[PDB]
């Protein structure tokens, strides 16, 4: 009745999507075959949000998997929960992108998108009242960014009055293993700033930092890395599927968190993360959840919010809890930190409460922060782009595929304008009519 | 007071039997999961033991995890 | 030979594998060391200078 159509782009998007579907299948009580075996009647009240009914009491996800190499599709299919996806929603090309944004955007990603958009349009038209589209991809590769941005642009052209959420795995400063990674990132942010409703920046260095210094795991594999992302994906849309005291859907979160259409880059975090040996020392109640959300270590991006100002903050709590404590902690943090919040928006913090907790817990919380300290990410990508671009390194791979050198210059200019507008919205006074209120 | 105690005793015994039935169902679920896991791991161990025509062709009709658990 | 005083594996210095045997999916952080039993047996801790 409010459906979210899932799109997974590239190898990173495919593995994150497989982990996310594994998470919410156990949330809704779905076996690897597809049928339902649960204990509550509230698990099938709102199940059409992500699932599609089949015969014999089976449910299949409303997801479209996209790749330019069939190996990751084979790996996803041969997984534990790989028999739930419909076989017609795997769209894989035969020749890879080869870590090239031009290959993903003009040469090899221009013929796969008709076949992708056929499935996307049939899944969008099958819904009752569509709520939005979701995308999971990474800006460091070829298939995820180079064809994912083109899919985003075509979807935004076809369905303008909808919601477009994206989960972007932005480049890492220290963990960077590919050389053309700043090229791909800089040529993707110009698309994401122009035709996207919400963007969540997720960073592998921050995921490794949380998996090492908080969870205290000896072996932080990509399964542990993707569980952290899947928890946030579940928590941001739990208010659609489960009842609560104060509901808030993605449209409401976007309205309250996005003050201007060019400012939609958010930072995520997940609240109850503890270790097996150190969970006996901690009672995880609402002050602990708020404390661990607002702790600057817990961000999933490689940006420290102490350097900037929190433009807007939203948080979705899960479980049975009293609303007095929920309102009290979020008033107290704003009263304590007076210089970390912008002063031309009063009550920067939005609260939502859902009733049913996630698997294995009794209470939980999720934090999404629109901060101005995201501009240092774009500044770092720009300073690593210019260093290669002045010497014209790795430029023939891009310019032999129908590209021009003017597109790189315009990408630089729009990234500079983005960081300039973030800086001007940071260093802005609230007690002034500047120049447009000359009507008096 | 005897009628009130009679009704309250009936309610208490009904509640006790309800909790006993719930505990039995949870135990049944745990046992079924454990036996299905053990049987599948044993079958995979036997298959690897053969790996490292008279019997390998016959052992292809091993029931799935769904039949081991009890769903048909 | 005495293992009462020899230093054993650290719980705070090197939070990394290849130090403890077996398969463990979480760090130790439990506060029980290898020579704790023999140290408790040889050196008992019973009150102090004050009290009977």
């Amino acid at each position: 009745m409010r459906e979210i159509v899932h799109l997974q782009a590239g190898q990173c998007g495919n593995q994150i999507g497989a982990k996310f579907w594994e998470v919410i299948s156990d949330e809704h009580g779905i076996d690897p075959t597809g049928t339902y075996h649960g204990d509550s009647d509230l698990q099938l009240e709102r199940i059409n949000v992500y699932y599609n009914e089949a015969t014999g009491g089976k449910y299949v996800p409303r997801a479209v998997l996209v790749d330019l190499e069939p190996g990751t599709m084979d790996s996803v299919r041969s997984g534990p929960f790989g028999q739930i996806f419909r076989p017609d929603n795997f769209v894989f090309g035969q020749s890879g992108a080869g870590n090239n944004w031009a290959k993903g955007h003009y040469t090899e990603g221009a013929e796969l998108v008709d076949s992708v958009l056929d499935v996307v349009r049939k899944e969008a038209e099958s819904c009752d009242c569509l709520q939005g589209f979701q995308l999971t991809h990474s800006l460091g590769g070829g298939t995820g960014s180079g064809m994912g941005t083109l899919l985003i642009s075509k979807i935004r052209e076809e369905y303008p009055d909808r919601i477009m959420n994206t989960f972007s795995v932005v480049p890492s400063p220290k963990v960077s293993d590919t050389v053309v990674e700043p090229y791909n990132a800089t040529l993707s942010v110009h698309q994401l700033v122009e035709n996207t409703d919400e963007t969540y920046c997720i960073d592998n260095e921050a995921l490794y930092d949380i998996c090492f210094r908080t969870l205290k795991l000896t072996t932080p594999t990509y399964g542990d890395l993707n569980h952290l992302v899947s928890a946030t994906m579940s928590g941001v849309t739990t208010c659609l599927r489960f009842p609560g005291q104060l509901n808030a859907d993605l449209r409401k979160l976007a309205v309250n968190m996005v003050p201007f259409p060019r400012l939609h880059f958010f930072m995520p975090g997940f609240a109850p993360l503890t270790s097996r040996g150190s969970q006996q020392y901690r009672a995880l109640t609402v002050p602990e959840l708020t404390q661990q959300m607002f702790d600057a270590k817990n961000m999933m991006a490689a940006c420290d919010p102490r350097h900037g100002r929190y433009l807007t903050v939203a948080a979705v709590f899960r479980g049975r809890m009293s609303m007095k404590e929920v309102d009290e902690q979020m008033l107290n943090v704003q009263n304590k930190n007076s210089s970390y919040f912008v002063e031309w928006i009063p009550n920067n913090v939005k609260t939502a409460v859902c009733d049913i907790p996630p698997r294995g817990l009794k209470m939980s919380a999720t934090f999404i922060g629109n901060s101005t300290a995201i501009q240092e990410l774009f500044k770092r990508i720009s300073e690593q782009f210019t260093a290669m671009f002045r010497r014209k390194a790795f430029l023939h791979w891009y310019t032999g595929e129908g590209m021009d050198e003017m597109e790189f210059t315009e990408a630089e200019s729009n990234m500079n304008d983005l960081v300039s507008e973030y800086q001007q919205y940071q260093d802005a006074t609230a007690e002034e009519e500047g120049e447009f209120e000359e009507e008096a | 007071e005897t009628r009130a105690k009679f009704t309250q005793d009936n309610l208490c015994r009904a509640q006790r039997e309800r909790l006993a039935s719930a505990n039995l169902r949870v135990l049944v679920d745990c046992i079924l999961r454990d036996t299905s896991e053990d049987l599948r791991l044993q079958c995979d161990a036997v298959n690897l033991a053969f790996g490292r025509q008279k019997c390998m062709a016959h052992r292809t009709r091993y029931p799935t995890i769904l039949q081991l658990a009890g769903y048909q | 030979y005495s293992i009462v005083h020899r230093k054993c594996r650290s719980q705070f210095t090197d939070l990394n594998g290849s130090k403890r045997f077996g398969i463990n999916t979480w760090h130790d952080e439990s506060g029980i060391y290898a020579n704790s039993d023999v140290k408790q047996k040889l050196y008992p801790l019973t009150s102090g200078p004050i009290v009977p």
Partner: peptide, 25 residues
């Protein structure tokens, strides 16, 4: 049985990679 072979190879590599003493040393 190829799929089950892939599953058991996944389990075996899981055991090898999660034995942290043998993986690093």
């Amino acid at each position: 049985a190829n799929l089950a072979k892939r599953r058991h190879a996944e389990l075996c590599r899981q055991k090898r990679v999660f034995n942290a003493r043998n993986r690093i040393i």
